[PDB]
């Protein structure tokens, strides 16, 4: 009830400002605690950069450094069953993923780019910037 004019109910319809609970919907919905998509599957890091040059080794030391991998594997191509596409590195604990995505995802190194994406499904709250309104670049 923004304001009661004491004449009508609500002729004009406005949907932009809402002060009460905020936050559209809940985080990852409200499933029965554990139905399938468990949050413990955060340590699953999908690594990608090179195609036929994607080596679990380079990604092993490179990624395991910031987060020791428990189960590392590369996502090969089912077309020729050859090593390609991209790799995967499952960190020991989901707590390690935070460090991976924090300082390993898109890690634009001088000669390479460490693209790392979680395998889990969810946490689609943010949207990577998503356009911006000015900021700098005058002089």
Automatic annotation (TrEMBL):
It comes from the Eukaryota. Residues 18-28 have a biased composition (Low complexity). Keywords: Repeat, RNA-binding. Residues 43-121 form the RRM domain. GO terms for biological process: negative regulation of gene expression; positive regulation of signal transduction. Residues 18-38 are annotated as: Disordered. GO terms for molecular function: mRNA binding. This is RNA-binding protein UBP-1. The chain holds residues 1 to 139 of 224 of the full protein.
